[PDB]
Copies of this chain bind each other. A is one copy, B any other.
Amino acid sequence: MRLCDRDIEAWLDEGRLSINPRPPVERINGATVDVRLGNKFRTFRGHTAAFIDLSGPKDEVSAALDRVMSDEIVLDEGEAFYLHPGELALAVTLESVTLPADLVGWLDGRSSLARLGLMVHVTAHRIDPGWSGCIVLEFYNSGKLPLALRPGMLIGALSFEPLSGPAVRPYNRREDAKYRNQQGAVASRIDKD
């Protein structure tokens, strides 16, 4: 059961669900709230490494991720991020989202974006109960034309689903959770497994 727009407004009103800054009524409809693009981005630099060993020694994985991730890219005013066909980039939503333990959220892209080849995630769009933070985005342009992305644009949408009950281990209270306190285009923390 997804929350319809009126119920999202009420959960936002009771305050155990928070989205900061809260999108206006124009941006809450049907069963979704729209989200916008922030100004933090990351690209990859392959020429430093042959591969990343997802399960190799923790220490060596940490080194690798550091050699292939650029530092965080912040665009100056009026500047766009040019997302080219075939070139994965990280970003973040403008909004920070905080979910109570009895709710899960799901991120969609936008049909208007899909129709130009823009994926907003890479088969990982689940915002967990306990989640608090901005939501990281994995952009892939599967299209034929580069796309200029500007901070501020409508980039995705969130739907919300009350759970059968309060999660007994929500994200915020879980010791090996990787991304609590998320805020920019944070790179993979696969080396934490």
Contacts and interface: CB of A to CB of B under 8 A. Distances in A.
Interface residues of A, number: 96
B162 A52 contact: no
B1 A164 contact: yes
A126 B171 contact: no
A193 B112 contact: yes
Each complex incorporates copies of this chain amounting to 3
Given A52-B148, A126-B32, A2 B112 contact: no
B90 A108 contact: no
Interface of A: 1-7, 25-26, 28-32, 44-46, 49-56, 68, 80, 82, 87-88, 90, 101-102, 104, 108-126, 128-130, 136, 138, 140, 142-150, 152-154, 156-157, 159, 161-171, 174, 176, 178-179, 186-190, 192-193
A116 B146 CA distance: 20
A100 to B, nearest CB: 11
Q: Name the residue in A1, A46, A130 with the highest tally of chain B Cβ atoms < 10 Å from its Cβ.
A: A1
